[PDB]
Symmetry: C2
Amino acid sequence: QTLQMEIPNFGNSILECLNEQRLQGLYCDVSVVVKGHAFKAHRAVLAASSSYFRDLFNNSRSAVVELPAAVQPQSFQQILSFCYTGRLSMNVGDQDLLMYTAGFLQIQEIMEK
Amino acid sequence: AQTLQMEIPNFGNSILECLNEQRLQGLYCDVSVVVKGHAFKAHRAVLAASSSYFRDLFNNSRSAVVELPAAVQPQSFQQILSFCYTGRLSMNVGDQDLLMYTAGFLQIQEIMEKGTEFFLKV
């Protein structure tokens, strides 16, 4: 006799809270610095969507990581937001940079087919 | 915050599932919660999203290891931890009282409120 409970779309709700947390700088365990702009985040969430961060966080315990000159802050901001929401916004004029950065950071689900 | 170029449905559902797998392998975890000498790796963020007790505990401390009081049992805790990462709670008839007590202690408010509830599994 098993008793069972199941909350529908639980992950959807939890990731929203994690995004709120990040937006308010709560329970973050890494700071990612891009051209002198610091973004707080959770390693776990970055790792879930990026094989680049997966490999980096597998191999380094530093509290801050700085990305190379490739990555620009606006682009990174969009990618970060994607990792917490599954939404990627449109970028008029810098779609090439955004795509380059997504590829660089090996964001696996951002491109299709 | 205008035009999206992509939107993955049910993204959070899949990501939390990834987070659960990471925990089960000890990856990218930032806290170790110890219960009657049994240590559990976790992510503070995932605990805090579901547990008012943990939110509090993490703000009144600066420590990678947390020890829960002796009133909290390991098997029950494991069930609560899994729930925080899945939204599913499972257990045997005969263990519901202990699980409910543990959920109360850790102030998992999704567990004891209106909405979905426990059932007998098929």
